[PDB]
From a paper:
While sequence analysis suggests that LsrF will function as a class I aldolase and genetic data suggests LsrF is involved in P-AI-2 processing, the details of the role LsrF plays in processing P-AI-2 are not known. To begin addressing this question, we have determined the crystal structure of LsrF, alone and in complex with the P-AI-2 analogues ribose-5-phosphate and ribulose-5-phosphate. LsrF crystallizes as a decamer with each monomer having an (αβ)8-barrel fold, a ubiquitous fold commonly seen in proteins catalyzing aldolase reactions. The LsrF oligmer has a disk-like structure, with two rings of five monomers stacked on top of each other giving rise to a decamer with D5 symmetry.
To identify the catalytic site of LsrF, we determined the structure of the protein in complex with two P-AI-2 analogues: ribose-5-phosphate (R5P) and ribulose-5-phosphate (5RP). In both structures, the ligand electron density allowed definitive placement of the phosphate group and illustrated the general path of the carbon chain, but was of insufficient quality for unambiguous placement of all ligand atoms. As an independent confirmation of placement of the phosphate, the LigandFit module of PHENIX was used as an automated means for placing the ligands. The automated procedure positioned the phosphates in the same location as was modeled manually. R5P and 5RP bind LsrF in the same location, near the entrance to the (αβ)8-barrel with the phosphate group oriented towards the coils following β7 and β8. The phosphate is located near the positively charged side chain of Arg254 and is positioned to form hydrogen bonds with the side chain of His58, the side chain and main chain of Arg254, and the main chain of three glycine residues: 226, 227, and 253 (in all cases with N or NH groups). The ligand then extends across the center of the (αβ)8-barrel, away from strands 7 and 8, in a largely polar environment. In particular, Lys203 is adjacent to the ligand; this residue has potential significance for the mechanism, as equivalently positioned lysines are responsible for Schiff base formation in other aldolases (below). No large conformational changes were observed upon ligand binding, though there were small movements in a few binding site residues, most notably Asp251 and Met252 (with α-carbons shifting by 0.5–2.0 Å). The P-AI-2 analogues ribose-5-phosphate and ribulose-5-phosphate bind to LsrF in the same general position that other aldolases bind phosphorylated substrates (e.g. E. coli DERA and FBPA, T. tenax FBPA and M. jannaschii ADH synthase), suggesting that the canonical aldolase active site is conserved in LsrF.
Numbering used by the authors:
A (entry chain J), B (entry chain B), C (entry chain C), D (entry chain I): 10 to 176, 181 to 289
Amino acid sequence: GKDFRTDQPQKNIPFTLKGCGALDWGMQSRLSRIFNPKTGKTVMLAFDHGYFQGPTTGLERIDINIAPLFEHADVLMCTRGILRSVVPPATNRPVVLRASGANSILAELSNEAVALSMDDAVRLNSCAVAAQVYIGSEYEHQSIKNIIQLVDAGMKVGMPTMAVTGVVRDQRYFSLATRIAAEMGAQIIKTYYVEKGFERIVAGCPVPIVIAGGKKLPEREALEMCWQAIDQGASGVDMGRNIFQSDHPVAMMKAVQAVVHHNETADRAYELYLSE
Amino acid sequence: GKDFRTDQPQKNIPFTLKGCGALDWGMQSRLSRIFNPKTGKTVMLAFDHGYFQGPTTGLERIDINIAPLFEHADVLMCTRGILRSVVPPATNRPVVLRASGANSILAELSNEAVALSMDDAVRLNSCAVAAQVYIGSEYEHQSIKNIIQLVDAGMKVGMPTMAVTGVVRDQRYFSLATRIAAEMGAQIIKTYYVEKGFERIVAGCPVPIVIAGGKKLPEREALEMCWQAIDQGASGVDMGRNIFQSDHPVAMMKAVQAVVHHNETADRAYELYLSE
Amino acid sequence: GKDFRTDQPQKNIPFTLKGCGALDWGMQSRLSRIFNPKTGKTVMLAFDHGYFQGPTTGLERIDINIAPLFEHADVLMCTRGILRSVVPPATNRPVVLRASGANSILAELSNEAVALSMDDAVRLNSCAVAAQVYIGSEYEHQSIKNIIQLVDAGMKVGMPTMAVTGVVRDQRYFSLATRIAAEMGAQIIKTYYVEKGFERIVAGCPVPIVIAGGKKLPEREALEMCWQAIDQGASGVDMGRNIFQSDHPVAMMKAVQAVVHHNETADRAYELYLSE
Amino acid sequence: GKDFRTDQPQKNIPFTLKGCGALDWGMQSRLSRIFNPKTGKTVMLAFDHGYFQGPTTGLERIDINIAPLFEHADVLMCTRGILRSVVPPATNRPVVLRASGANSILAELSNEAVALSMDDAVRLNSCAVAAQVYIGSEYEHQSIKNIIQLVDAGMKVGMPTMAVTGVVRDQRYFSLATRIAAEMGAQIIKTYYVEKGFERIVAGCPVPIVIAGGKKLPEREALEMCWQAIDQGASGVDMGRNIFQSDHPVAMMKAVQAVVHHNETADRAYELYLSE
Ligand SMILES: O=C(CO)[C@H](O)[C@H](O)COP(=O)(O)O
Ligand SMILES: O=C(CO)[C@H](O)[C@H](O)COP(=O)(O)O
Ligand SMILES: O=C(CO)[C@H](O)[C@H](O)COP(=O)(O)O
Ligand SMILES: O=C(CO)[C@H](O)[C@H](O)COP(=O)(O)O
């Protein structure tokens, strides 16, 4: 009384996420927590700015202002200090840990060291670990070594590494920064959007790219940036200020989600924003 | 231009999951992937039976019959063999790995060893590891050592361990089995439902309890068992046969969800089942 | 003067080998050395018999009789002893190492221990490690632990493990043995061909299956066995005696290749054998 | 009924690859994947340039432009980033991993660190690891330490190390750079071809030498360079730009193969190129 359905051979289901078709199950799994398998994109809520800036505007009280935003985000990005202290585990949301630091706004910005062991990243159930790369800055060499070290460590354990291109911001520059990081082994790259040439940054990069929100803009303009980035091949956005510094954070997020996952237009989305 | 809201002191949000209020963030995080933070319960789809039974009825073709069920489950339970081979990572669903084995239906059932290293559990992004405890069986001592070893290893890494009471099935017996496992350190206990006294099993166990589906029953009766268990304090169910051996697996799951998360009645639920 | 071809998005190339679509690059790479990416099959030349049998017939002088066969094989299977001593490295052919032993024909056949460290497997540039599983035998439990240990070790390093079902030989039996091994984590399973029901063994096994040659048969019959096995879904054969005990080894191998990779018929192939 | 052929004593088959006749089996095995045992030479397709140069011309889209070349190459050389992301494991071609980096075209070129752990090299099934040595540059000391560290690590595991002489380019200079690297332990040395004295570079180096393609040349001239190098004792070439920057990459590769493995002349080969 058994049915082995032998008339129908077993076939493998392809894993389509850009440049991640040759990774182990666990690593693909963590990546799938970050990039929605359906759309292949992500809306990432970033609040790690304090790691070298202290209580930056809008992030004075993560526990009050940012707490109510978690549920509306695909993934959270922050440090292990904040994570443990004020992000409730019950939030049940994927996290990407800031794993670099030891710099401040009072000194050389590019002077970063690895800020948490892979050991602890695993203890904290991370989906990924993130560090800055500073191409063209004084501590460029060290910043790349930080990426090398996180990748070496993450491959033992199936933890993805996200390289962030920290900074003249033109296409030829970001092409250089993103490609090197990818080349070194980072599975996710986060960079800035550029007025012209962005398409080339995406095309030249073998792995998923995510754009930073950047300094505060009018909500409508912020949404235009997102639409452009997505339309030109970005795999999602990593917003911080353009959300938590808005008068209507939750509304802004829903708009951003509309644009990223559902191919909404900048205008349509802005009207989704005006209804909240 | 900053607002520290100093008139409103920061307060810790309590973690209410039974007997898990004193664990590290990462472990609480993994637990919150299993047990819905809202309802505090879980509907677990179990298909690990093959680990000592080979191609058991209904599990001949996981890739065909079980594949379409994944999305309707809170968490998946299976071996690392099946996980890698036929469970697509894009399933984006929390997993609990069977971590014991080395036994078969052709020999002593209680003769189990640890079947995967914590190393590989982490590599596979697990939410927990599971192993059998056989109180009263020939290899009782070894089975408990399996639990001891998984907890020792899990605590370094923030991985919860689930102890399963494998087997006369009365209340006094399962009280003994579940309590000992909890006492050794397992964070989740999975046991069988009992006609009378089940409430005492839950009350005597300091951590969350989950019931096994058990042998195939008429759908209506299986739902009654769930309702009873939940009503008497279980934290969810770990169904296998009563789902994948049904003529309407997806329908049955929706029913079981209704009973577990939404306090549906056995009858009402059964009518949810008859509509699909 | 650069062309990023931004009109043409990058797409992942699927890895189609049965149940190996969720493995890291290096492991998929080693598997691709074994299973021809085009056909998805393998012809494996096995000469490890001496590991518990001593100088078995046909394998008295590997250096003389077997040496001239290597080039005609897809992959070699043998022990590290023979590998180092008489297989010339310049053979440039992928190897699968026998990694179990400590038994002999003078004692209990199922009493095997792991016979080489993963350390040394990596040192020898192996494509996989192989060990016996003895379901139903006296040392069944230990044999399965051997597989558990090799998988744990292999996963750290991207080395595949092949589980071999050592032994009444019917379908229900081999279904049990193969499925349990796969379930524990082995990426390759090698078993015996069966008169009836073989299709069910393949269908119930989530990873590639390879058949043993078995005791010497008339060349025409051996080819019929291969044809049946392949036709019913096997991923290749692991011949030993039916090749090296033939009066025309090289001829026989070319036949077997014809059947496995090129869908030749038993008869057509036998005529390929009669021309050499 | 056994034949031990005792009238014919067993004899060791010599391993002839220059200066590798005293290595363990595994290491000789990996070297044999790189240097064809028959000819003793190799045609190596190099596309690692991006590791410090970003999207260099011709390598904007490895996945499109370089993908179709793989099959026509003896061995692939690239970074672990590119390997995992866009080189399909099914390519079934030996790889040599770029294992240095942390420099860029925006800073001191000779400032390289080890870019991937031997751990991960083994995980990726490499045939060798490669790093730059910069004799005469500012970070000369560190670059040599990079070779020392890779050799120490490779010897535990049977992984060969390839030292690359990065840079006035005359014979006395490259003799110094190549000889030092070899002396430290590197089993493969890759250097540049020189108008006069190249023969002395080869003679003075105890292990196999491979030449870099160098900047783009007219196809006919590039082939002349290969012919000279081979004729004067090189063990193969590591082309990049002279292939992927050609209007007929595949044709060019076939030509190069002709010259390296089959002792074709520059002219004859060029006519092989004009027919494709
Ligand atoms: O902290 C940073 C890196 O050092 C980034 O500026 C930040 O994480 C990006 O998010 P946003 O610009 O949208 O606030
Ligand atoms: O495999 C088992 C333990 O050895 C269990 O029987 C199983 O996992 C429980 O699920 P169900 O009884 O609902 O099928
Ligand atoms: O050695 C063995 C396992 O203990 C097998 O019998 C052998 O390797 C299979 O090959 P063949 O039966 O074709 O000779
Ligand atoms: O990348 C390099 C070293 O830093 C080399 O220039 C390169 O790998 C050699 O190949 P080619 O000169 O033929 O392009």
